């Protein structure tokens, strides 16, 4: 009856739209299921311009590839929102949504209405949140031990690159936080670390730096590249005027005023430079090994470069907006706009300042600080995709170690949490039902759908997932009667079980909590949608 | 049964996206695709290598045997080739030497993996096979170095470094091209008894100015720079002025005006009579102080007005435009002066010294000669090339750029040392990797044995491009290492190659140690990426 | 998001195949598709019904109000409409009567079914509601029958049967069209009363000849068949009377030819001289035996050679050409003759009797008159139909065939079994089924009560096409049926019916004086076909079409 409204309108009703939600989610999952786990496949994204991007994360894959199917758009927007807050769980949510639909689609063909199926999802999900509190283990972060942070940070890097580059990047992402902490305020920000993209050495030769690194080099040759003692002066004002707000001009009567009107513009430039030179010599005069460095966010007049060249002052222009807040935390200084108010108290301090020339550009390095409140990570690569592949591995590793400090509770990984929910959701007894036979149908579909995560890990390793999970259920049966609590994981090497706590594999709290809740809502709305309609004016 | 189901995934993604995944293709298929471009580089390898003509869509023809230059101008749709193309780009940017070795070695590592995958060896264990074999390769390169040299100063010491690099490119010239680079390096290096702390060296100290016509043997080395411009106002004084102070001004010579647009405002006619002589005496005051300091040459990057050129012509002061800013700092290093944006008056400490300046035509076009004899130059020089064709001189400039790149790679680290060439090092690495596989049992032995097989392409390419049989000379080369004199065995290119043994120390053909270490790390990582990509995703157009 | 999945796995069938199911309102669209052609036949119902013009692809125009004839030339698309189209064609073939009733009744059963489906009644329960109500409907028709035709032929009784049937088809004048058809029926009846023989009748016996020009009042009835023919040799009025002896030959008149390689063989000039005079003596010897028997007319079934027509003009024997078959077959039924293939002397017992053969100008061309007289009666009489337009001549021919088909209804059953006309038949069934719906417990009473509502279309259509308000006239008619039956017998209220124009306000008193009645044998099959036509549409849950 839709064509009577518009001739060009099309629709698919009841099972016609139901087969779409099951097929489109299964087709999208089949592509992204091969990326789950450390043995997962590596995708190469090639656009029309010729750019190559190697990443195993679903956030970049779904962003570069436009999805024509409307059903998979909900999964893409759900996996995108999962990467925003938790920085992880893109592939996990995609594998859960497609599995919740296929497991529930089998009951629909048996005559089960989708309404009671959505009931079994919400009742079983609330029981999983209660089990999540008992299954998680609280940790003490007051000791700031390295061994605990190395294993948690390595688990995220094993899903990106091989073990050779992982062991190099594991202490880097562990050092990515370090001196950035607060006991009382609880505020933790990962935007203070800087991601530098440059081709130097090899991707495995990268190292961590304890101080800020900038991409701007020395503009004048006489500016010393290496400075032992430098006072960073933050200047947000532009020394070179781009334009005057009120339109004005210079009208000279005689040619003698031409050089005078040109010197009139020389007074405003020298007025800002007069207080800067007096600030350097204010501390101590004729003092070797003590330099003075200025980092400016706006442009610097090339004419004024010779003014600082005689005093051996390093100047940097066109700094990033996020760089100003980082100068206060690293160098310990204070952000200043104009030069009207200066003092040695607002000046920063750095123990080592040097610059290196890589290619046709020069980079500024700052390190050796007393109590730096921020740091950086230098990402080097041998090619174009090496910078994008390592960056996606670090950014996904940053959010992993942050949730450890945000939430002291740590949940073991390696599919140990998904298998534990299987036996718990089989029989709910009289606790939560709400109906006779109506709710138990949706709970059974949600319980068996949580086993896709451990089975997908085994399929990427080339083993039999049914034989691996068979020995898992045999160990959990004897562990209940032996009065011993054991966490059984999945080992992809020998095709046997393991202990995530001993093997060093853990998962974040916010990643698993938002994945179960996020995948439940997407799969529920697709089961509750019986018609797919398209209408509009071209 | 007439039409196919079209698959359900056809509606997923778009029709422009193409997929190549495991068991879906690739898997030694795509490896067979790069063999077309791999054979292109095999014919260009060695002193007998063949140059390749490439015509870009713009119409410019670049004839060179360098793999990094050829793959840059070629538009390649196949994505996995760009992994090898970008691998050769790193070799040219950083080290600048070994671009042909990276493309050939990385291409053979994918060819020897054809047998490994055919035997059922997964790509996961293949990556671990090359990584452990690459670490053992870099550790064995230090014990094979007999060419350790602490000098890096005398000209004869560069015959074992710069000359072997020039032997490959433009093999028709050996002592002619080597003398041009060796003399240019001797000029840019400062004269001192002992220079430590790794004195700074850059590729901008040696330059190449190509002039059409003339034989290559007629070329010479000039300590200054040669630019093509038009002098104005007078003929040079030759040596009558001897050393003359040269002032380099960044801003043009003219009465200083504000950045905003001004105009003349005349209220009465009394200022009109003084307006003509006002601009004359205003700029003359700044030009008079320059002649009092003895400055015979003024260089202003921007355009100089006629009012400023009028005064400088009678005092005999040279004016040179130098429009480009990059070449402006190069003339400053010849005289050793400081670029001054202000006009003011020249200060004695900021002025340089140039012995003589002359204007002559090397190829029929007038150029200005900055050559300075007996003077002090710092990190500046040039090489004037003479050739009949423009395309032949293009690769010669790249051969000089590759010759000075070896000096940069030699000077910056502790040292580049030396390695035996002409297939001597590649054969010695075969016996090291082969014996390394038998020391540690396991499944990685298949990847270690095939890793040494890929080293056989370099020594046979010299024999293949020489018109020799690789089933005779090459097998007889392994028997020569049976056992110092067994490390100096190498490949011979000559009509006398029938014996297949020529001493390397006779011609002194050596390769840098730091170049081979950087070439293997890039070639191994490039071949590792192709085997580590399970699925390929394409796009429309 | 930009483009739909466009029904995945639709490649199982060709792109031209479409699937339509009872769900998604397609069963409602199918009922709505009936109303497009239903209103076309509503304005054509009754004596005031309006004829329709339908132009085919060849340009032929057929103007008729008959639902069975109109649906023939129309190109039907919707599949369930063809169920209604082919249902009206069967009613015209079988009983030759009540064609517009099947079209309207089957369409109203689907209209009342739209409310039944909306209330949730399954297709199975709706079918069972109409089947149980139809069995009760057929039983009440036999209880409400009044009067009978009794004797086969009567001058007055044939005005109570053919006249009300032809009143709806080209109404015009009443007694003019009724006398023309009633006269031709009395001639084809064998009569022979008190003999106990089984009566017999043929619907193809009466033939209607369309002749343009003149007026309807100038039409007459001819006992013999009328053809357009030109006599070859001469025209003869045959005023010498004493009737005639006529013979019919289905084979042509000519020298018998060998079916294989007929060829003239002449060996010598002696056989050539006698070959020309030999063929002349053959026809002379064969035609002499026919002339000696007193045969003044010969009917030929094919082309006759010129040599045979020569000797026929010598003895003054007429020549008739009867092409094809059926035209010659009905000629012998008039004169009572038996055709024989040979050219020899016919048997005197097989010769026919025709008193006069006349040729006169009627519509501008020469027609031959086979008309019979009082004695030596003939069968398969023809009716000369005069009219100004040929379009009126086509439907009146079908209007006469409707009266001829009504005569067939007087043979197979025990009698005529007249029913009250003017829509009084379907109105009385409304009150009877309403009482029947209450006597049946359960949920099946919904389809039974609505089955009687579909009978309200007959009084509403006759009132709407008559220019009267259906809101004022229809409820006033139930006042006669709302008083049920009194404490005394002899109730004449069953004769109330719908009136056309005039004074309105019900009217026409009791229809017994109007003499318009209906046939019981027609209403039996009219309800059965119309019910199965609507049942078939409601019994189809899914409809599949090809190429469109
Ligand atoms: N080495 C491993 N062994 C077993 N399971 C692992 C291993 N590494 C990761 N996993 C499991 O894979 C899941 C997803 O991890 P990861 O790939 O980092 O996130 P995503 O799938 O969102 O990219 C985690 O829940 C974890 O339990
Ligand atoms: N005259 C010669 N005789 C024998 N071998 C030579 C001669 N000239 C060059 N070769 C060999 O040819 C090889 C060419 O290698 P080349 O492509 O220059 O290496 P790279 O790519 O590092 O520059 C050198 O290793 C050198 O040993
Ligand atoms: N003059 C009249 N007054 C009242 N009713 C009439 C009159 N003429 C015809 N009718 C009724 O109209 C009905 C029309 O029947 P119709 O459907 O036309 O039969 P058919 O389709 O066989 O011609 C008849 O049943 C008859 O009872
Ligand atoms: Mg992850
Ligand atoms: Mg070389
Ligand atoms: Mg009728």
Short mmCIF file of N, CA and C in Angstrom, two decimals, chain A residues 136-231:
data_model
loop_
_atom_site.label_atom_id
_atom_site.label_comp_id
_atom_site.label_asym_id
_atom_site.label_seq_id
_atom_site.Cartn_x
_atom_site.Cartn_y
_atom_site.Cartn_z
N UNK A 136 35.14 -9.35 38.57
CA UNK A 136 36.27 -8.42 38.50
C UNK A 136 37.08 -8.47 39.78
N UNK A 137 38.37 -8.15 39.66
CA UNK A 137 39.31 -8.16 40.77
C UNK A 137 39.85 -6.76 40.96
N UNK A 138 39.75 -6.23 42.18
CA UNK A 138 40.26 -4.91 42.49
C UNK A 138 41.77 -4.95 42.68
N UNK A 139 42.45 -3.93 42.16
CA UNK A 139 43.90 -3.83 42.25
C UNK A 139 44.28 -2.55 42.98
N UNK A 140 45.50 -2.55 43.52
CA UNK A 140 46.05 -1.41 44.24
C UNK A 140 47.03 -0.69 43.33
N UNK A 141 46.67 0.52 42.90
CA UNK A 141 47.51 1.32 42.02
C UNK A 141 48.41 2.29 42.77
N UNK A 142 48.38 2.28 44.11
CA UNK A 142 49.23 3.17 44.88
C UNK A 142 50.70 2.77 44.82
N UNK A 143 51.00 1.51 44.52
CA UNK A 143 52.39 1.06 44.46
C UNK A 143 53.06 1.48 43.16
N UNK A 144 52.28 1.67 42.09
CA UNK A 144 52.81 2.06 40.78
C UNK A 144 53.87 1.07 40.29
N UNK A 145 53.53 -0.22 40.35
CA UNK A 145 54.44 -1.26 39.89
C UNK A 145 54.46 -1.33 38.37
N UNK A 146 55.64 -1.62 37.82
CA UNK A 146 55.78 -1.70 36.37
C UNK A 146 55.28 -3.02 35.81
N UNK A 147 55.53 -4.12 36.53
CA UNK A 147 55.20 -5.45 36.00
C UNK A 147 53.70 -5.59 35.74
N UNK A 148 52.87 -4.97 36.57
CA UNK A 148 51.43 -5.05 36.35
C UNK A 148 51.00 -4.25 35.13
N UNK A 149 51.64 -3.10 34.90
CA UNK A 149 51.28 -2.27 33.75
C UNK A 149 51.87 -2.79 32.45
N UNK A 150 52.98 -3.53 32.52
CA UNK A 150 53.58 -4.07 31.30
C UNK A 150 52.71 -5.16 30.69
N UNK A 151 52.12 -6.02 31.54
CA UNK A 151 51.31 -7.11 31.03
C UNK A 151 49.97 -6.61 30.49
N UNK A 152 49.38 -5.61 31.13
CA UNK A 152 48.12 -5.06 30.65
C UNK A 152 48.32 -4.30 29.35
N UNK A 153 49.41 -3.53 29.25
CA UNK A 153 49.68 -2.78 28.03
C UNK A 153 50.10 -3.69 26.89
N UNK A 154 50.77 -4.81 27.19
CA UNK A 154 51.19 -5.73 26.14
C UNK A 154 49.99 -6.45 25.52
N UNK A 155 48.96 -6.73 26.32
CA UNK A 155 47.80 -7.45 25.80
C UNK A 155 47.10 -6.69 24.68
N UNK A 156 47.12 -5.35 24.75
CA UNK A 156 46.51 -4.56 23.69
C UNK A 156 47.40 -4.46 22.46
N UNK A 157 48.72 -4.49 22.65
CA UNK A 157 49.64 -4.38 21.52
C UNK A 157 49.78 -5.69 20.75
N UNK A 158 49.54 -6.83 21.41
CA UNK A 158 49.60 -8.11 20.71
C UNK A 158 48.52 -8.24 19.65
N UNK A 159 47.45 -7.46 19.74
CA UNK A 159 46.38 -7.48 18.76
C UNK A 159 46.62 -6.50 17.61
N UNK A 160 47.77 -5.83 17.59
CA UNK A 160 48.10 -4.87 16.54
C UNK A 160 49.27 -5.37 15.70
N UNK A 161 50.46 -5.49 16.29
CA UNK A 161 51.65 -5.89 15.55
C UNK A 161 52.19 -7.20 16.12
N UNK A 162 53.32 -7.66 15.59
CA UNK A 162 53.92 -8.91 16.04
C UNK A 162 54.57 -8.72 17.41
N UNK A 163 55.15 -9.81 17.92
CA UNK A 163 55.76 -9.78 19.24
C UNK A 163 57.08 -9.02 19.26
N UNK A 164 57.74 -8.86 18.11
CA UNK A 164 59.00 -8.14 18.07
C UNK A 164 58.80 -6.66 18.34
N UNK A 165 57.88 -6.02 17.61
CA UNK A 165 57.59 -4.61 17.84
C UNK A 165 56.78 -4.40 19.11
N UNK A 166 56.04 -5.42 19.56
CA UNK A 166 55.27 -5.29 20.80
C UNK A 166 56.19 -5.08 22.00
N UNK A 167 57.25 -5.89 22.10
CA UNK A 167 58.18 -5.76 23.21
C UNK A 167 58.89 -4.41 23.21
N UNK A 168 59.02 -3.77 22.05
CA UNK A 168 59.60 -2.43 22.00
C UNK A 168 58.58 -1.39 22.45
N UNK A 169 57.34 -1.50 21.97
CA UNK A 169 56.31 -0.51 22.30
C UNK A 169 55.67 -0.75 23.66
N UNK A 170 55.86 -1.93 24.26
CA UNK A 170 55.24 -2.20 25.56
C UNK A 170 55.74 -1.27 26.66
N UNK A 171 57.05 -1.05 26.84
CA UNK A 171 57.47 -0.06 27.85
C UNK A 171 57.13 1.37 27.46
N UNK A 172 56.95 1.65 26.16
CA UNK A 172 56.62 3.01 25.74
C UNK A 172 55.20 3.37 26.16
N UNK A 173 54.23 2.51 25.83
CA UNK A 173 52.86 2.76 26.25
C UNK A 173 52.69 2.61 27.75
N UNK A 174 53.56 1.84 28.40
CA UNK A 174 53.58 1.82 29.86
C UNK A 174 54.14 3.12 30.41
N UNK A 175 55.19 3.65 29.78
CA UNK A 175 55.73 4.95 30.14
C UNK A 175 54.88 6.11 29.63
N UNK A 176 53.83 5.82 28.85
CA UNK A 176 53.00 6.89 28.30
C UNK A 176 52.33 7.72 29.38
N UNK A 177 52.17 7.16 30.59
CA UNK A 177 51.54 7.88 31.68
C UNK A 177 52.59 8.41 32.65
N UNK A 178 53.18 7.53 33.47
CA UNK A 178 54.24 7.89 34.40
C UNK A 178 53.89 9.09 35.27
N UNK A 179 54.63 10.18 35.09
CA UNK A 179 54.55 11.35 35.95
C UNK A 179 53.20 12.05 35.89
N UNK A 180 52.29 11.64 35.01
CA UNK A 180 50.96 12.24 34.94
C UNK A 180 50.07 11.41 35.86
N UNK A 181 49.73 11.98 37.02
CA UNK A 181 48.86 11.30 37.97
C UNK A 181 48.31 12.33 38.94
N UNK A 182 47.18 12.00 39.55
CA UNK A 182 46.67 12.74 40.70
C UNK A 182 46.01 11.78 41.67
N UNK A 183 46.38 11.88 42.94
CA UNK A 183 45.78 11.01 43.95
C UNK A 183 44.37 11.47 44.31
N UNK A 184 44.21 12.74 44.68
CA UNK A 184 42.93 13.24 45.16
C UNK A 184 41.98 13.61 44.02
N UNK A 185 42.49 14.28 42.99
CA UNK A 185 41.63 14.87 41.98
C UNK A 185 41.09 13.87 40.96
N UNK A 186 41.78 12.74 40.78
CA UNK A 186 41.30 11.63 39.95
C UNK A 186 41.29 12.00 38.46
N UNK A 187 41.60 13.26 38.15
CA UNK A 187 41.58 13.71 36.76
C UNK A 187 42.78 13.12 36.02
N UNK A 188 42.50 12.41 34.93
CA UNK A 188 43.54 11.81 34.10
C UNK A 188 43.22 12.10 32.64
N UNK A 189 44.14 12.78 31.96
CA UNK A 189 43.97 13.17 30.57
C UNK A 189 45.10 12.59 29.73
N UNK A 190 44.74 11.90 28.65
CA UNK A 190 45.71 11.32 27.74
C UNK A 190 46.00 12.21 26.54
N UNK A 191 45.40 13.39 26.47
CA UNK A 191 45.67 14.32 25.38
C UNK A 191 46.93 15.15 25.61
N UNK A 192 47.60 14.98 26.74
CA UNK A 192 48.84 15.71 27.00
C UNK A 192 50.04 15.08 26.29
N UNK A 193 49.98 13.79 25.97
CA UNK A 193 51.05 13.15 25.22
C UNK A 193 50.89 13.49 23.74
N UNK A 194 52.01 13.73 23.07
CA UNK A 194 52.02 14.16 21.68
C UNK A 194 52.41 13.00 20.77
N UNK A 195 51.72 12.89 19.64
CA UNK A 195 51.98 11.86 18.65
C UNK A 195 52.71 12.53 17.49
N UNK A 196 53.98 12.19 17.31
CA UNK A 196 54.81 12.74 16.24
C UNK A 196 54.91 11.73 15.11
N UNK A 197 54.71 12.20 13.88
CA UNK A 197 54.80 11.37 12.69
C UNK A 197 56.02 11.80 11.89
N UNK A 198 57.04 10.95 11.86
CA UNK A 198 58.26 11.22 11.11
C UNK A 198 58.86 9.89 10.67
N UNK A 199 59.57 9.92 9.54
CA UNK A 199 60.28 8.74 9.05
C UNK A 199 61.74 8.86 9.47
N UNK A 200 62.15 8.03 10.42
CA UNK A 200 63.53 8.00 10.87
C UNK A 200 63.81 6.62 11.47
N UNK A 201 65.07 6.19 11.38
CA UNK A 201 65.48 4.86 11.82
C UNK A 201 64.55 3.78 11.28
N UNK A 202 63.95 3.01 12.18
CA UNK A 202 63.03 1.94 11.85
C UNK A 202 61.86 2.00 12.81
N UNK A 203 60.71 1.42 12.43
CA UNK A 203 59.56 1.42 13.36
C UNK A 203 59.85 0.74 14.69
N UNK A 204 60.78 -0.21 14.72
CA UNK A 204 61.14 -0.89 15.95
C UNK A 204 62.23 -0.17 16.74
N UNK A 205 62.80 0.90 16.18
CA UNK A 205 63.86 1.65 16.84
C UNK A 205 63.34 2.86 17.62
N UNK A 206 62.03 3.06 17.67
CA UNK A 206 61.47 4.20 18.38
C UNK A 206 61.72 4.08 19.88
N UNK A 207 61.72 5.24 20.55
CA UNK A 207 61.99 5.31 21.98
C UNK A 207 61.06 6.34 22.62
N UNK A 208 61.01 6.31 23.94
CA UNK A 208 60.18 7.23 24.72
C UNK A 208 61.02 8.39 25.23
N UNK A 209 60.43 9.58 25.26
CA UNK A 209 61.09 10.79 25.71
C UNK A 209 60.35 11.33 26.92
N UNK A 210 61.10 11.80 27.92
CA UNK A 210 60.54 12.31 29.16
C UNK A 210 60.14 13.77 29.08
N UNK A 211 60.27 14.40 27.91
CA UNK A 211 59.95 15.81 27.77
C UNK A 211 59.39 16.11 26.40
N UNK A 212 58.89 17.33 26.25
CA UNK A 212 58.18 17.73 25.04
C UNK A 212 59.11 17.77 23.84
N UNK A 213 58.57 17.38 22.68
CA UNK A 213 59.29 17.43 21.41
C UNK A 213 58.43 18.19 20.41
N UNK A 214 59.04 19.14 19.71
CA UNK A 214 58.34 19.97 18.75
C UNK A 214 58.90 19.75 17.35
N UNK A 215 58.06 20.02 16.35
CA UNK A 215 58.43 19.83 14.95
C UNK A 215 59.07 21.06 14.32
N UNK A 216 59.10 22.19 15.02
CA UNK A 216 59.68 23.41 14.49
C UNK A 216 61.16 23.49 14.85
N UNK A 217 61.98 23.87 13.87
CA UNK A 217 63.41 23.99 14.06
C UNK A 217 63.86 25.44 14.18
N UNK A 218 65.18 25.60 14.34
CA UNK A 218 65.76 26.93 14.45
C UNK A 218 65.65 27.68 13.13
N UNK A 219 65.10 28.89 13.19
CA UNK A 219 64.92 29.69 11.99
C UNK A 219 66.20 30.39 11.55
N UNK A 220 67.14 30.63 12.47
CA UNK A 220 68.36 31.33 12.12
C UNK A 220 69.57 30.45 12.43
N UNK A 221 70.62 30.50 11.59
CA UNK A 221 71.77 29.62 11.83
C UNK A 221 72.50 29.90 13.14
N UNK A 222 72.66 31.17 13.51
CA UNK A 222 73.41 31.52 14.71
C UNK A 222 72.70 31.11 15.99
N UNK A 223 71.43 30.73 15.92
CA UNK A 223 70.72 30.26 17.11
C UNK A 223 71.33 28.94 17.57
N UNK A 224 71.79 28.85 18.82
CA UNK A 224 72.41 27.60 19.28
C UNK A 224 71.43 26.44 19.25
N UNK A 225 71.87 25.32 18.67
CA UNK A 225 71.02 24.14 18.61
C UNK A 225 70.93 23.45 19.97
N UNK A 226 72.04 23.36 20.68
CA UNK A 226 72.09 22.73 21.99
C UNK A 226 72.21 23.79 23.07
N UNK A 227 71.31 23.74 24.06
CA UNK A 227 71.30 24.67 25.17
C UNK A 227 71.26 23.87 26.47
N UNK A 228 72.21 24.15 27.36
CA UNK A 228 72.28 23.42 28.62
C UNK A 228 71.24 23.92 29.62
N UNK A 229 71.07 25.24 29.74
CA UNK A 229 70.08 25.83 30.63
C UNK A 229 69.25 26.82 29.84
N UNK A 230 67.96 26.54 29.70
CA UNK A 230 67.06 27.37 28.91
C UNK A 230 65.85 27.75 29.74
N UNK A 231 65.42 29.01 29.61
CA UNK A 231 64.22 29.52 30.25
C UNK A 231 63.17 29.72 29.16
#
